[PDB]
Structure 1
Amino acid sequence: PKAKTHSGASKRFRRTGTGKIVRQKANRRHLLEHKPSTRTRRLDGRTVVAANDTKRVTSLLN
């Protein structure tokens, strides 16, 4: 009767001004001693969703 949006998807993915979806990488909240600042630079940012699963995600958010 009326759609629902997967909440966790809405709380993890952000649609941009155009047809793209980004992921906040944050494998950096538990343990950070052995991880160098280099690896944290690699993880830091909001990368684009891989095209091997955008076709699923867009229906998860819509």
Structure 2
Amino acid sequence: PKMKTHKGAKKRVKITASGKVVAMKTGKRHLNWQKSGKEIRQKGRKFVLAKPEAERIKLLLPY
């Protein structure tokens, strides 16, 4: 029958206009204890490739 979106993915990565997959930078939910502002800061969003391609394929019905 029909297809189910993957909530796991839907909950952590956003898909943009150009069809690009964008998600937070992984490495700071707790690592830290002292990491030079630079590291702990430098955390906006980012991409992937051949990998985001794999994502979009799970967020179909949610386009």
TM-score (norm 2): 0.75
Read off the aligned partner of 2:25 and give its amino acid letter.
K
1:6 aligns with 2:11: no
Q: 2-side partners of 1:3 and 1:36: how far apart?
A: 45
- Segments of structure 1 that go 5 or more residues without pairing to the other structure are none
- Segments of structure 2 that go 5 or more residues without pairing to the other structure are none
Root mean square deviation, CA, Å: 1.6
Match of 1:47 in 2: 46
Structure having the higher strand fraction is 1
Structure having the higher helix fraction is 1
Kindly, what percent of the aligned residue pairs are identical?
Answer: 37
TM-score (norm 1): 0.76
Read off the aligned partner of 1:56 and give its amino acid letter.
A
